[PDB]
Amino acid sequence: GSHSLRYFLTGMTDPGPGMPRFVIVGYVDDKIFGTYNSKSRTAQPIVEMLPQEDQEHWDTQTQKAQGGERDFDWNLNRLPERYNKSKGSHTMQMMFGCDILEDGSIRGYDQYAFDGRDFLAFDMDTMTFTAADPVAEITKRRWETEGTYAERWKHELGTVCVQNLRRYLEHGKAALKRRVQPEVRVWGKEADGILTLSCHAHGFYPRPITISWMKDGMVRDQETRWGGIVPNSDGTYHASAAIDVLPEDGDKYWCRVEHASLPQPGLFSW
Amino acid sequence: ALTPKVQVYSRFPASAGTKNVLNCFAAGFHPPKISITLMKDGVPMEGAQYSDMSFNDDWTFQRLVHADFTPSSGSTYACKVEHETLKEPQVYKWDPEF
Ligand SMILES: CCCCCCCCCCCCCC(=O)NCC(=O)O
Ligand SMILES: [Cl-]
């Protein structure tokens, strides 16, 4: 019963051809629910997840986003010189949100990164900042001495975020509760003396999945390598594991897949 | 590293002649500027869409590119990735498993 809302904010001085300088992606329980970017200058739900959003909500979101784009612009303009590294392209990132745990207690997250490196972080439950380095300390001391950010973001993390998570879980409940089984394909190919067995899980939701290989009823972690969990475009996920086998033992190897959509783990051969 | 880590996969278990989607996922890279091109027989595929820039919890950037396609048994499908950490574009071949 644990649920999460996360915003992932990027500001870029060199985004690339036809690409926005400032992007916000919002996730509920590993599903993108809304987006903002500097080219559209509007915050918009993923209608697949949120089919009936009111305009009022997304006006507010669009304006908070635009304010976030201004602040990133101000960071990207001051930070490089402060770090005596004004040469090059530059990035600014922020991750923030909240968790509603199964018992109803709350967790807030609020983290910043400059040029891909930890910069600053804020802890809602104590309302204290931490800086990643002496230059970030300048920002930390200015913000905590002014007093306003900690109130703001205590409120943002522990109230506003919590309310919106509760809202998105309800509005997107059709999409959030639909469990989506993995579609699994096992495949080998024999080069030189070895046979590569690959087990691929296609299109599952929710995102947590386990894949492992078996000879007899014994796993074989030592020769397995995992591709990791990667996204599809439709809010499902893809995962995979590979293992190399003597070509005269491939019928003895079984791919095991555990997923919330499967009452029992599923066993798949080549 | 900080170069792209690239995986190429189809949305569904692939089968010759059945409409599908080819995905190219590049992750772990910085800076965020990056070129990813889906290709059939070295011709760029049409209709490709690119995910909004996002990143991993370690701040490393990532991007999904996808495009409708109908895999052909006699075609090579690849993903070409250019990034300032690379001296020459790297191409990654789709393994159709069929
Ligand atoms: C999914 C699209 C909807 C986006 C939701 C809007 C939330 C954006 C939050 C503003 C980010 C503010 C940055 C910052 O740290 N400014 C400095 C400061 O607050 O003093
Ligand atoms: Cl079979």
Numbering used by the authors:
A (entry chain A): 1 to 270
B (entry chain B): 2 to 99
Provide the publication's sentences verbatim.
To further ascertain the ability of the chicken YF1∗7.1 to bind N-myristoyl-Gly ligands, the protein was recombinantly expressed in E. coli and refolded in vitro in the presence of the most abundant N-myristoyl-glycine (C14:0) (m/z 284.223) identified from the mass spectrometry analysis of the YF1∗7.1 elution and of a N-palmitoyl-glycine that contains a longer acyl chain (C16:0). Next, we determined the crystal structure of both binary complexes that also revealed unambiguous electron density for both C14:0-gly and C16:0-gly lipopeptides. The C14:0 and C16:0 acyl chains of both ligands were located within the A′-pocket in a very similar location to that of the endogenously bound mammalian N-myristoyl-glycine (C14:0) sharing similar contacts with YF1∗7.1. The glycine exhibited slightly different orientations within the binding groove. These structural analyses provide crucial insights into the binding mechanism of N-myristoyl glycine into the YF1∗7.1 binding groove.
